[PDB]
Structure formats: structure tokens, C-alpha cells
Design a protein around this ligand. Structure first.
Ligand SMILES: ONCc1nc(CCCCNc2c3c(nc4ccc(Cl)cc24)CCCC3)ccc1O
Ligand SMILES: ONCc1nc(CCCCNc2c3c(nc4ccc(Cl)cc24)CCCC3)ccc1O
Ligand SMILES: *[C@@H]1O[C@H](CO)[C@@H](O)[C@H](O)[C@H]1NC(C)=O
Ligand SMILES: *[C@@H]1O[C@H](CO)[C@@H](O)[C@H](O)[C@H]1NC(C)=O
Ligand SMILES: *[C@@H]1O[C@H](CO)[C@@H](O)[C@H](O)[C@H]1NC(C)=O
Ligand SMILES: *[C@@H]1O[C@H](CO)[C@@H](O)[C@H](O)[C@H]1NC(C)=O
Ligand SMILES: [Cl-]
Lengths: 532, 532
């Protein structure tokens, strides 16, 4: 049949889901690794052993064990990113949408969720892939990987807890796509991985990792990049939090073997319930267990691999939102509220600044501070709040990404930069928060295109042509069509550094995104902190 | 007789000079100290021994031995600043302009010329006092003092050459006014010292120095401050420069007594011809022999005195011109030409900042560089040259002065702060230089009132109300005439820190003069340089 597909590990039976006026096929909850439980917690995935009979793949799988944001109970804006199914350690499954009728050898887009490496689900309504697969005639996969200590606890040296097993999870799913997408009419040669935030850092790290480079063709990165300050740790600091996690749970601490055996007997939510107590600073936009630079998944430092060009050469498409930081100030920084305008007394501004650059010394704090205040109007509660919003956005996403897009372009074969800044009309958060981190994703996944979600006609259009940009990029490596009258989105080149606005107005090209603050962030303050 | 006056040191006979279709009496080249010649070179002045007979005081006196600028031979724009009389170590003479008829007891303003403490004459055309004494009915005095090595060679411990003796020439002239001004109808209880650049710095340092506090009433400072980075040095630097001068002339360098011996046998121009070989770095806006923070004239460091309030509490009148640095880049930094727009390429721009901040470590260099660079336009010749202008303007005048005006206002009895930014219509220099360092002086001294000098009628008005500001402040301690119709120059207060624009247009009030750059130059960069 059409809804029956026979992979190299077993048969699976999908379901005919409707999407706008029509229907397509979906195969949800497909196993791709052996469940990682018991003795297998903190270890590299093992490929799912083959099954007999037909795997019922008609409902979403479980979500992985993860922290559950309860700051705003009932609030859709925060609830929409929480797990929506049961949470098991048995969670390494993927989902495929196939256009109906099944095409032969078509482009494949693998989605990779983010969530700071501490949270995120393959099964959220925002990652519902039926719209984009259908409208742009692509095969859409969305994978899953372990998060928090489950995915990234790291005792380098031990093979029982090496670290980066979450990235190894998503490489196994990619290797599953490589061997089975052809049985869904996916072309294993036209595979595009794409991810947001942690998921975008992840995309970046596969571009860098020699063990992952052959499992895909191209890459999209949204508001995330492999070199972000929150996105990695040294083995030493990785070890330290691993060890202190043992200390919170009154574990034996002499050797990794004893430590891990102690940590493997704890119920999963005992781990989640102390996961934040291992961070070295009072901070915003930092997460406890993240990828390690161990030397195996990452040959050397990310900077050196960028400099030597020791990475995958292909075309990348990538960009950032306008207000990356507003979400993280609302959760961790004083003076900000969901229900107020959040003007910020200057005293809170300093508290906010020291939170945003936890690692800086005093002199660097002053540099960050002088760099972002209007000294004709320092007690202006708005300019301070926008002040902080730009600090955490520029520090944690934008300037890290731009450093990556300049480094990569010296060696890549194509680069398209975007700047998404569309305040949705139906959005739930207050206006001060602007274009929220993560809220480009609705347009990528075509959610403006169903009329029951009450979007304006414009955001629909903008969603349809972002999907086309993404899809066309995934097919041809160029988001523009060759006929297509208007309006070509220019290559990003080392000398001219062009990019485009994603929003409801006619597209405009710009040069040097945030060059001024990014010189501060990528060259100067690094220099200040090294020498002081 | 009106032109014959009996002072405490002897009888003086003056001259009846015409002025603007009237006349007044001037007393020129009046001695106030013993000539500091032979064994008196480098030593503290001694009060002029009383003479017999009548001193023919109708001609200007000699100028001090000083460097002479030959960069543009014949060009009035620079020869305006060079000595216009013969030069001699016998140069310590003041000049008096008395209204006619003689006042009974009227205000006295004492001009203190600048010239980087290396140059300057009381007898320049632009310091002709007849116009302002005539127009605002004040007793105008114009003093002199040794400059460069003659005025500030500094070997602490040695009382044959202590340092600061150029400033002591000033104070001896100041006490001469104290004791004798009453005989010209001046009031020693209403004396206003005022000077420009090196002069303004000096005016500044008499309000610090205890031996000076009681020799005047008020203080006007123009484009100069005691705390200027070029305005002083330590004993250690002052001695090493004294010693390096001896090295440049084959002097005996074992003791000071032999050192100073050797130096007083050298002919004055032999000191001038090597003067500059002694600076520590290839720089701009720095000068060889300047005041020393010795512990006698200056009891402690300038900052401690500013913080502790250890200075004289009075009313000050001070301010700056719009483009203090343009003159100094024309003479010292690559790519500036007098006959060009001096569009600055970027490689010359950073030669510029290095020359501009000679004491900066490299980390300080990038700090300065990124704060004056439009990184969407780094090869914009204009903005680079405009940029470099601001750097040396802000670093050497603007921001030091604002530091002083805020430090002082915490303790004085009235601050009035100005921003001169009128480009004189008949200016000989090219327009890229703007409101050049030193060219408010023509308006202070009323030259636009001379018709043959071809100033615009609007320039005449600005000169007239500038001298009134100056003169009205010199008597009342306040620029304005109370309960009069003209718009009113507001006090500078610690909280609102207001100031006004001097120019042909109706008066504007502004707030915080160049705070953002000044926060950099006054709080952050100094902090950056302490650390390693
Ligand atoms: O901001 N400080 C705290 C803070 N408490 C809460 C309260 C609810 C769960 C607490 N869980 C967390 C803890 C800490 N940091 C966290 C950062 C982001 C997030 Cl979502 C949870 C964190 C550091 C160590 C203590 C726990 C919510 C947000 C929040 O930020
Ligand atoms: O920077 N302007 C002018 C400038 N002229 C020259 C030569 C022309 C006049 C000589 N006298 C000078 C010397 C030195 N530095 C000076 C700085 C400012 C002034 Cl006025 C005169 C200076 C450095 C050591 C050598 C002599 C050389 C370098 C230079 O920079
Ligand atoms: C597949 O699983 C769904 C989920 O409960 C169930 O409703 C459906 O009947 C199952 N189909 C078969 C053929 O087992
Ligand atoms: C990509 O590579 C091909 C062949 O290696 C080359 O001709 C083309 O110019 C490259 N394009 C870019 C944008 O790097
Ligand atoms: C003073 O000097 C001037 C300048 O030469 C001269 O004209 C005048 O007659 C002199 N007066 C006396 C009394 O010597
Ligand atoms: C100056 O001092 C007097 C008393 O000494 C005081 O009444 C007055 O307010 C002060 N003026 C200023 C401008 O500080
Ligand atoms: Cl200009």
C-alpha cells in the first residue's frame, strides 16, 4: 500500500492526515534507536533493533525527560513550547510527513527542535509539518534527541558518559534518514537539516563535525549557531557540573564509575529537579548540560575549525529575529514583567547587565554598560529596557551568528542571511518583547495558512514565501527561482555582506547586519577579557 | 597727568592710543620682575628692583625665547601666532590698558596667553587690549611668562631649577597687579584672570595653587583646563626630560648642579633647536616642558584637589570651541593638508589615533578606535577625518574641561559654561578645520569691531555681546545683567549641567556637553589603562 512502508528495520503503517482542503501521509513515532534506559542512560545511542510485523506509526511518540516551564500556567505563549505528550526516557523516535501521492526521490527537510539543550519536543503544534510538506512538495522529517543531563552530562574519558550523546542521537536519526527516506520517496541526496536556537547550534555542529558531514547536503540555521556562548562547555567545566550534579543528589564522587552508577539509579525527575543548581553563575541565557568540546565529535576548538575551514562546504541559509533577548529577560532579569511595559530603573539595568554577561570581569561590565546606554538620558526606563534586550540578543545570538556567517563564507559555496522582524498581529506576549525568539517558526511551518488560527492575509503570504524560500533553498541551494520576476534575495559575500528583511513589506537588501555592536562583541570585548 | 603714574617700583609714562574713533591710555612693556638671565635662568623670578626716573612705557616689550613656527612661511593664519617683536630672555613685562578718562576703582581683567607652554606673546595683534578695555570700561592687563625650557625645566630637589617657574612669573605679575593696579584706576579686589589653551590651563592652576588663590577674584577659562593631559607631568618625567635635554647638548649628567650649569651656558636658541627631541613618543598635542606636579605649587595631585574641594571657591566662566583638534592634526598627522579636504584613508586614520593617544596600550588603542568609527562606512574619508578631529578635540580639551567643570561645580559659587562654534567668515584656513582652536579670541578682544578687518555685521554683534558677557561676568560674577531683556545664560548646576552656544544665532541652552564621549574619556578609558 501507500501508507505501508517497509524500512530496513521493519514495516511501519502511517495514517492519512488532512491538511487544508486535502490530505497527505504521516508516519509518526518511528523508532530510530534502542530505548536508552537503565544501564544505557548517558551513553551513545544504539540503532533500533529490527522488529517483526507492522509498527503502528499513527500517533506522535513520547517527549523526552525535560524541565517543564510553569512560570505562566495556562498561558499559551509559554505552554506552546512545553511537552504535549507523556515524557519517557524511551523517547528517540522521529516523524515523517509525505506528500500524497508519494513522489519519487524528492527533497528532504529534517527539523531539529531547540530549547537550550535542556528542553524541546518533536511533537509540538508549531513543528506540525503537514503544511510545509504539502505546500512545497517536500518530505519533512522531525527528529528527537535527549536533552538536559540525559543528553549532555559529560565525564570525558569515561565511555559510560562521554557527552554529546544528544548530538549523537540526532546523528543516528540522520543516519536513519540516509537509509530509509528513499522508501518514503525521499531523495537521500537532497537532505536539508534545519533547526532553531539550540536546534540551530545543532545544525552548526553537524556542519563542523566530521562524523556528521556526509549525512546531509545543506543547512538552515535560525537564531542559533555552533559558536554561541551558551551552546558549549569545556570538558573541565562539563566535568565540574557533572560532579556537582552528583553532589546535589548526595552521590558517591570518587570515580566516574561510582558517580554514574549512582546517577543511573535516580528517577529522571530527581535529575531535572536539581539540573539548574550546577550552573557556575547567576545568569540569563545559560543552561546546565550542553555540548562538550571533547575532541572526538569536535576535532578541535570551534574557532580553529572555522579558521582553517575544517568544516562541511556547502550552502547555508540562516538568520535571526529582531528581539532575541526579550524572552530571557522576562524570566531571569529584574524589573521585567509580562503584564507591564517593563520600564527598567537604571539600578536594575546594572543588575540586568551583570546577569547577561556572567563571565565578564568588572572592566568588561563597564564596557558592556557604556556601550549600550544613551548618556544624555540614562534614567529613561525604556532606553534601558531596549538596552538590555539588545545586549542579550546581540551577545547570545546575533553577533555569534554573524561571526559564524563571516567565518563560514570564506570557505562555503553559498550564504543567504536574513533578519526576521515581523511583530505578528495575533501574538500573545506584550509589545515590549517585540519579535520574540522562536516566533519565526510559525511562518516556516506554515501556521498562518489555516484560517482558524486567525492570522492576517499578509502573514499568510509571508509564511508562504518563507516556506518557498526554505523549500526552494532545500531543492536548489538557492532560495530564488530562476524565472520568478521579483525579487532576488542576494548572496552574502565576504566584501559586500548583503542580507534581506523578512516581513510584510517588499523585500529590501541591507549590508553589515549589526556590524557596530558585533565588532564590540566579536572582537573588542573578547580582547578586553583575555587581557584583563 | 593721566599718562604718568607712580607705582611702588618707579614712575611709568604711558601713551595715548586711538581706538575706534576715540582714544585711551596704554602702558606697555612695564617690568614686573628682574630679568631671569645668566645665573637666573631656570630660577624663581625675583621682583623688579625699583628704578629711578621715568620708564618710557609706550612700546611693547620683547617676547620670550620660544620656538617659532615656519611650517607655512608668510601665511597670516600661522604667523598671527608667532612673536611680533624681538626675542630675549629679558621678556617679563606686563601691559595695561586704562580707559580715558581714568576710572576711580574699576574692574581688572588680566590676559594670560597660551601656546602650549612652549610659545606665546603678550604683544600679538590679536591680544590688542585697547578694544575691550575701551568698549566695556575695564582696566585690561596682559602679562608674560617664560615658556618651554626657560619656563619649565624641572629638576625636583634642585632649587636652582625647581620647575613651574613659568607659572611663578605669572603669579609675580599677579602680585604686581595687586600692589599697583590701583594707580591706574583698577580695583585689586575685582581682578579676573583669563587665558586660552595654555593660558586657560594656567588660570585653572592658580585656582588650585594656594600661593595664587588670593591674587584674583574670578576666572575665565577658554579651551584649557588644569587637568589637561598635555598640561602637566610628574617630577620623574619632568626630570628625565630635563636630563634628556642635557644629553642632546653633550652636558655633564652626573649631578644637577653641573647639568644646570652646562645648560645656562648654552645660547637660548641652542635650547630651542633641540626642545622637541625630548618627548617620549611620536605624538600630537604634547609639549616638552610643561608644569610639574611638584608638591609645592601643587600641594597634591590635581584629582585629589578636585575631589577634596582643595581649591578656590569662586565663579568661573569657561568653554570650548567646536573643533579644538583640527589645527593639531594639520601639523602632525598623516593625510591632513592645508590645501585639501584631508579625506583620511583608514590606514592613516589609525596612524592618527596612535599619534593621538600616545600613552595608550594597544587594548586602549582599539577602544579609542571603535568608539569613533562608523563601521558601516570605515573608508569614508570624511568621517575618518571628522572622526580623528573629535578624538584629539575630545581627548585634549573638551572632556578634560568638562571633568573640571563638574568637579569644580561641586564647590564653587557659580559656573557658566559655553560652546563657541562660530566659523569666522574671513577665516583664512580651509573649511575642514571648522571652529579652530584659538579663534574665539578675536571675538573676546573685539577685533570684529574694526571695519577694515572686514567682519560681517553679524560677527560684530557676537563680539560685542561676548565681551559684555566676559566683562559683565568680571565685575558682577555673572554673565548677565539681571532684570534686563536679553536672553539669559543659565548657571551650570550639578544636576542639570546646562550650557549655551556662542554664535550669531539667538541663544540656545543645551544639557550635558558631549557626555557620551566624555564618559569614555573620563571614566572608562582611564580604567582600561590601569588594568592588565
Ligand atoms: O532565574 N532564576 C531562577 C528561576 N526560577 C524559576 C522558578 C521555577 C523553576 C526553577 N528553575 C531554575 C533555576 C535557576 N535558573 C533557571 C533559569 C531558567 C529557568 Cl526556566 C529555570 C531556572 C537557577 C538555580 C535554581 C533554579 C523560573 C525561572 C527562573 O529564571
Ligand atoms: O607634529 N608637528 C610637527 C612636526 N614637525 C617636525 C619638524 C618641523 C619643526 C621641528 N619641531 C618638532 C619636532 C618634533 N615634534 C614636533 C611637534 C610639534 C612641533 Cl610644532 C614641532 C615639532 C619631533 C622631534 C623632531 C622635531 C617634525 C615632526 C613633527 O611632528
Ligand atoms: C494504531 O494505533 C491507534 C492509536 O490508538 C489505534 O487507534 C489504531 O486502531 C491502531 N491501528 C491498528 C491497525 O492497530
Ligand atoms: C560553488 O562551486 C562551484 C564549483 O566548485 C563554483 O563554480 C561556484 O562559483 C561556487 N559558488 C559559490 C557561491 O561559492
Ligand atoms: C618713548 O619711545 C617712543 C618710541 O620711539 C618715542 O616716540 C617717544 O618719544 C619716547 N619718549 C621718551 C620720553 O623718550
Ligand atoms: C554663593 O554663596 C552665597 C553665600 O556665600 C549663597 O547664598 C549663594 O546661593 C551661592 N551662589 C551660588 C551660585 O552657589
Ligand atoms: Cl567640520
Amino acid at each position: 500500500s501507500e501508507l505501508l512502508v517497509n524500512t530496513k528495520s521493519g514495516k511501519v503503517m502511517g495514517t492519512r492526515v488532512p491538511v487544508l482542503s486535502s490530505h497527505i501521509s504521516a508516519f509518526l513515532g518511528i523508532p530510530f534507536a534502542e530505548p536508552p534506559v537503565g544501564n544505557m542512560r548517558f551513553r551513545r545511542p544504539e540503532p533500533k533493533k529490527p522488529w517483526s510485523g507492522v509498527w503502528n506509526a499513527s500517533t506522535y511518540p513520547n517527549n523526552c525527560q525535560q524541565y517543564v516551564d510553569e512560570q505562566f500556567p495556562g498561558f499559551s505563549g509559554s505552554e506552546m513550547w512545553n511537552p504535549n505528550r507523556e515524557m519517557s526516557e524511551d523517547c528517540l523516535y522521529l516523524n515523517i510527513w509525505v506528500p500524497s501521492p508519494r513522489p519519487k526521490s524528492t527533497t528532504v527537510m529534517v527539523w531539529i527542535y531547540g530549547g537550550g539543550f535542556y528542553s524541546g519536543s518533536s511533537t509540538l503544534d508549531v513543528y506540525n509539518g503537514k503544511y510545509l510538506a504539502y505546500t512545497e512538495e517536500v518530505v519533512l522529517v522531525s527528529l528527537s534527541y535527549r536533552v538536559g543531563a540525559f543528553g549532555f552530562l559529560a565525564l570525558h574519558g569515561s565511555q559510560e558518559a562521554p557527552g554529546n550523546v544528544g548530538l549523537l542521537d540526532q546523528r543516528m536519526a540522520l543516519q536513519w534518514v540516509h537509509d530509509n527516506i528513499q522508501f518514503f520517496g525521499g531523495d537521500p541526496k537532497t537532505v536539508t537539516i534545519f533547526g532553531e536556537s539550540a536546534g540551530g547550534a545543532s545544525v552548526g555542529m553537524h556542519i563542523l563535525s566530521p562524523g556528521s558531514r556526509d549525512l546531509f547536503r545543506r543547512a538552515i540555521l535560525q537564531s542559533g549557531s555552533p559558536n554561541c556562548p551558551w551552546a558549549s562547555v569545556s570538558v573541565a567545566e562539563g566535568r565540574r557540573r557533572a560532579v556537582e550534579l552528583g553532589r546535589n543528589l548526595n552521590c558517591n564522587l570518587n570515580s566516574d564509575e561510582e558517580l554514574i552508577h549512582c546517577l543511573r539509579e535516580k528517577k529522571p525527575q530527581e535529575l531535572i529537579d536539581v539540573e539548574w543548581n550546577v550552573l557556575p553563575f547567576d545568569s540569563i541565557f545559560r543552561f546546565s548540560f550542553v555540548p562538550v568540546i571533547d575532541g572526538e565529535f569536535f576535532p578541535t576548538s570551534l574557532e580553529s575549525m572555522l579558521n582553517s575551514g575544517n568544516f562541511k562546504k556547502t550552502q547555508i541559509l540562516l538568520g535571526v529575529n529582531k528581539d532575541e533577548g526579550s524572552f530571557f529577560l522576562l524570566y531571569g532579569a529584574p524589573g521585567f514583567s509580562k503584564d507591564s511595559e517593563s520600564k527598567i530603573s537604571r539600578e536594575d539595568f546594572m543588575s540586568g547587565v551583570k546577569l547577561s554577561v556572567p563571565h565578564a570581569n568588572d572592566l568588561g561590565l563597564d564596557a558592556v554598560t557604556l556601550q549600550y546606554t544613551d548618556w544624555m538620558d540614562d534614567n529613561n526606563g525604556i532606553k534601558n529596557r531596549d538596552g538590555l534586550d539588545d545586549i542579550v540578543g546581540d551577545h547570545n545570538v546575533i553577533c555569534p551568528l554573524m561571526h559564524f556567517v563571516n567565518k563560514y563564507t570564506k570557505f562555503g559555496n553559498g550564504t543567504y542571511l536574513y533578519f526576521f522582524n515581523h511583530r505578528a498581529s495575533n501574538l500573545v506576549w506584550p509589545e515590549w518583547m517585540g519579535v520574540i525568539h522562536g516566533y519565526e517558526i510559525e511562518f516556516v511551518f506554515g501556521l498562518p495558512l489555516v484560517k482558524e488560527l486567525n492570522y492576517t492575509a499578509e502573514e499568510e503570504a509571508l509564511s508562504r514565501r518563507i516556506m518557498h524560500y526554505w523549500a526552494t533553498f532545500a531543492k536548489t541551494g538557492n532560495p530564488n527561482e530562476p524565472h520568478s520576476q521579483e525579487s532576488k534575495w542576494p548572496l552574502f559575500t565576504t566584501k559586500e555582506q548583503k542580507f534581506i528583511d523578512l516581513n510584510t513589506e517588499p523585500m529590501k537588501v541591507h549590508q553589515r547586519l549589526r556590524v557596530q555592536m558585533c565588532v564590540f562583541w566579536n572582537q573588542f570585548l573578547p580582547k578586553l577579557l583575555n587581557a584583563t
